[PDB]
Amino acid sequence: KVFGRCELAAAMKRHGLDNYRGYSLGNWVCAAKFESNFNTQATNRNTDGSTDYGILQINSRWWCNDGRTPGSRNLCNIPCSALLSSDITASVNCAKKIVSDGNGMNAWVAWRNRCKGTDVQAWIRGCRL
Ligand code: NA
Numbered sequence: 001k002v003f004g005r006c007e008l009a010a011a012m013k014r015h016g017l018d019n020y021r022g023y024s025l026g027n028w029v030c031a032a033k034f035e036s037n038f039n040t041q042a043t044n045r046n047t048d049g050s051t052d053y054g055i056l057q058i059n060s061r062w063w064c065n066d067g068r069t070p071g072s073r074n075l076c077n078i079p080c081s082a083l084l085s086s087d088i089t090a091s092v093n094c095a096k097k098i099v100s101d102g103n104g105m106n107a108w109v110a111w112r113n114r115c116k117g118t119d120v121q122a123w124i125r126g127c128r129l
Helices: 005-014 025-036 080-084 089-099 109-115 120-124
Strands: 043-045 051-053
Touching: 005 025, 005 120, 025 109, 025 120, 051 080, 080 089
Parallel strands: none
Antiparallel strands: 043 051
């Protein structure tokens, strides 16, 4: 599924991501924009052999099981495939664990490089929320 900007902001809000760990909804929409361009089926292979999955490009090294990341963990207790669903529930639940892990949204390198410090409210501007 390719979400619209405001459609994804509404879905993230419904799943309690808005101001989760103090991150406003525009932060999450910005991170999803640059991680996946709002595509739930986005995948990216890392040089280390791990894979990033879904709207927030969650990595198999720590967070999900894909059977092909030697030495990895599955701290969200999900198959990485669940992160590619049209339903964002598994991505949101897992993103809550990630952002709680100590470095906040710096876990998402694209958020640090493209969202952090910017006018992230622009990402929800005009949306009925
Ligand atoms: Na894993």
